[PDB]
């Protein structure tokens with residue numbers, strides 16, 4: 001039974017409710033859209 | 049990494065188990081006799097078991113007091129017990145043995161006629177040392193002239209010199225790295241390096257001694273897994289290696305280590321304690337012997353105790369690293385400056401080595417330190433001993449493997465007027481007990497010839513010729 | 519008179535206490551000490567092989583239990599008592615479970631008890647004891663019995 005088992009590391013100790021608060025504060029999101037330029041804003045003709 | 053005869057790996061464990069068994073038995077009859085001022089004991093019962101049950105049995109192979117300069121020949125004082133071997137006391141009788149356990153490689157720990165006259169003159173003009181630190185009143189002129197000789201010698205732009213070679217590693221590593229960093233050290237690193245890493249908050253891993261294919265596999269995992277619990281990025285990575293790994297006698301594989309540290313953008317911390325006056329055609333260390341550009345390593349630590357015959361340490365690097373350390377290193381701010389006659393004797397030794405003393409005996413030392421080591425090491429291998437290290441190293445440990453051969457190989461040699469050094473279990477791994485032989489440039493050929501026949505005759509009795517002779 | 523050279527590799531393990539148990543030659547000595555005690559018992563007092571195996575299995579109980587599962591800490595002061603709440607069994611392999619060297623140490627008290635029973639014709643005078651000893655040994659070495667005590671006796 002034993003001579004066939006697999007070596008495993010002992011389970012880890014889960015994160016605390018205080019540590020998570022820090023990680024949620026260091027994280028920073030990128031801007032929603034890339035910054036605009038001047039070649040990026042040409043208007044098309046308006047016809048009748 | 050060490051070839052061990054199988055039949056000797058078995059009579060060593062048996063020898064240690066017998067000591068363990070008799071020690072536990074004897075300590076069990078002391079705990080029941082203590083029946084015959086309220087504070088807790090200075091030391092528990094069982095934290096110094098191998099200090100009182102293994103070290104006290106052979107305590108006469110250590111701490112031998114000498115009464116002469118650390119030269120090729122010195123005088124060893126004799127000690128008796130007088131109370132059944134509990135407290136050794138020194139007599140007036142002396143001996144005259146062959147020095148093979150010191151460290152003066154270039155033969156500077158003596159009275160030579162270019163350095164001692166200058167140091168004595170720099171004494172009676174400066175009185176030992178200043179009582180202030182270096183940022184207040186302890187920066188004499190000699191302290192400013194010496195930090196130029198070291199920069200010229202080592203090769204890097206700037207250098208700082210301290211007053212202890214052990215504080216040069218515990219008071220600096222905290223500055224460069226902190227919490228969130230990583231330190232992939234080598235297995236066989238000095239105690240100062242590990243204590244310095246502990247004094248900060250950094251994490252320490254260990255890669256296999258002197259093999260880079262294992263250094264790569266550790267960096268890959270550690271950069272692919274981040275911090276151990278909250279998988280942030282590693283803020284830094286520093287790799288610490290040594291020039292010559294003493295007590296193994298091997299030169300490091302520096303070109304194959306720097307190349308892998310560049311790839312993963314890790315830093316390199318060199319440690320030229322044993323290899324700063326010994327190896328190299330000019331004495332510039334491993335970075336000259338192995339032909340590696342000195343600007344690929346970020347920090348280079350050294351020590352003047354072994355080659356230059358004077359206490360101290362140094363760190364060399366980019367001109368902003370030195371400016372940062374001179375402003376935020378506790379050892380530089382709070383500690384008394386290195387004494388003045390102990391700095392003049394480094395200046396006047398680097399002048400001899402570089403050949404700026406007028407004479408030319410700065411190359412005779414560098415050649416005779418090599419033609420002696422290559423002879424001694426070659427002769428020991430031909431007789432069948434097991435000696436480690438390469439061909440270009442002043443140290444050559446001889447393996448013994450048996451705890452009982454440590455007091456047998458040393459007591460005989462001392463009786464035949466040869467002094468050596470032996471290292472036991474609590475300091476080393478269990479299976480690897482050895483003797484360390486240090487060869488200097490002040491030994492003559494007549495001395496090595498005479499000392500080899502004393503060793504060859506002692507090695508028959510103990511039977512430490514594990515390899516076959518011819 | 520010397521052959522069979524082996525090129526031992528240094529496993530890091532960074533712990534003087536439990537790194538010597540990886541070099542070549544440990545298992546052979548482990549067994550040769552047991553086979554040496556067996557012969558020395560039935561020489562100082564002539565007896566039956568079965569009893570002598572029983573005395574070997576009983577002496578191997580106290581020595582192994584007191585060393586691997588009772589004592590806590592290390593006898594080296596260099597690590598500033600970092601392992602004060604752990605026993606020699608728990609320090610092994612940095613807490614890694616079911617390794618090559620743990621299974622060998624688990625397998626010995628069983629096979630040694632089989633020999634001390636199969637040559638003593640079971641009975642009850644010795645069977646009762648040997649069973650208690652091997653049971654204590656095997657329970658103490660269970661993976662689930664990691665850093666857990668019994669009623670807080672020698673636990674903190």
Ligand SMILES: CCCCCCCCCCCCC/C=C/[C@@H](O)[C@H](CO)NC(=O)CCCCCCCCCCCCCCCCCCCCCCC
Pocket residue numbers: 061062064065066068069534535536538544547548551552555574577578581582584585586589590591592593606
């Ligand atoms: C006469 C031949 C032997 C007689 C009896 C010898 C038994 C002694 C072996 C006990 C091994 C102890 C393992 C861990 C002990 C720890 O608790 C203490 C403190 O923490 N660590 C230390 O003192 C330092 C750690 C390493 C020191 C071990 C030195 C002994 C080396 C021998 C190990 C390999 C040979 C034996 C393998 C295991 C022996 C198992 C006991 C066999 C039972 C014998 C009774 C018949």
